[PDB]
Amino acid sequence: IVGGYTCGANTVPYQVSLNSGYHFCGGSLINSQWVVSAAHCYKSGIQVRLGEDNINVVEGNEQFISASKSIVHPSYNSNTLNNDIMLIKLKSAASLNSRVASISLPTSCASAGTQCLISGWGNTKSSGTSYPDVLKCLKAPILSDSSCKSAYPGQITSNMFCAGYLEGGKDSCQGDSGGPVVCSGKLQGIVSWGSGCAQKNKPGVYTKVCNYVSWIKQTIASN
Template sequence: MEQLTWSAVLLLLALSVRETLTQRIIGGQEVERYSIKYQASIQYNRNHYCGATLIRPQWVVSAAHCWRPAQLIQVVLSEHSLVEEEGFEQVFNISKILVHYSYNYKTFNNDIMLIKLSEPAKLNAYVQPAPLPEDDTPALPGYTTCKVSGWGVTHIYSYFLSPVLRAVDVQTIPYCHNYYYWRITDNMMCAGSRFGGKDSCQGDSGGPLICNGNLEGIVSWGISCANPYFPGVYTQVRMYVRWMDWIINSDNPNN
């Protein structure tokens, strides 16, 4: 009788967890149109495949694993729907791409790249750069609420991107090594939900994680999606602010 009762409890718990996961959407909820003014879409043949973040009028930052030859891709700002032309999009060819010199494609360490647009974006009510952390910006406490956004898949094991921009609130997860052991470096941070069900996923790569108003993370990698045992791993942007400033400030404006 005791064994039967324990089995019933396990079955009830399994059904409860399954219901929780299927009710939640990985990509969160559709955002108000053009409310995430720094969000960029990297596209190949006008098909979205990675996110990015506008940080200067002529520069966006993304994940290095999103690299493609510059002549094959475009960056789109003020994008909301991927399936309709809304009239506010700003579409740019690429002037140059600079992948971090120490990027390791096997471990995803230093998973960051800068993209220079063919011309400066027109800053307006729909397009504005995201602030970066500064030297005196306090460290993020564990379980800080942050927002991640993108057009990535909205269901576990799905292959279909969201047709509209979505966002979800996640929390920074301290002691990331406890989840991924030796794979985590000081250049990475984890964010998600302690209960699962909230996460970035395929198609969100390269997109922004905004904490306390600053760009703190870039969607990089993880095991599965929305898994309570494996939070999303992000490139820790504050480790690269000086590198980005050096690249941008030393750039030849004619190139």
């Protein structure tokens, strides 16, 4: 996250870190046994890490649970990033508490102008690289479909939305991928892509979770 603030330990209780020897992506806990992330985060050997503050320190509220399976969306296209969503199942259910908690799926798609919370452990620099180790947060509005398409000609599908600031300076970044965009207490987006980070006229692009609620529910019900 570039231009954000330190969230505070365990203040984003649905935020998970995906670890394969190291943190490589975020995710969102949507029930005691399932995480939503980005399809472009898929790999072998995933451990889901819940209750994290500093991802380099065991502070006392963590739960580390290996994945039993993951399910990339059937229509994910890695060239266009259309349908950039996957589900990850935990081998055992997490123990839910005030610091490890699920986030609800949306009932309705959120509108341009709605304020959301974007969070992650990704790079905090638009030029160069620095990883923060503690969770960073950014409050940002959803942008109009028109603004989003104008920023990225030929690239925005009906399964994507932009959020952030056209002026620059405040955005998600590398290492935030797969993490949450929460608006009014519901998971509306997944950190997906953008050109650089926090560049003028290049806002963040997010997977539009409301389009996937039926797929998520039906997949969980049978897996």
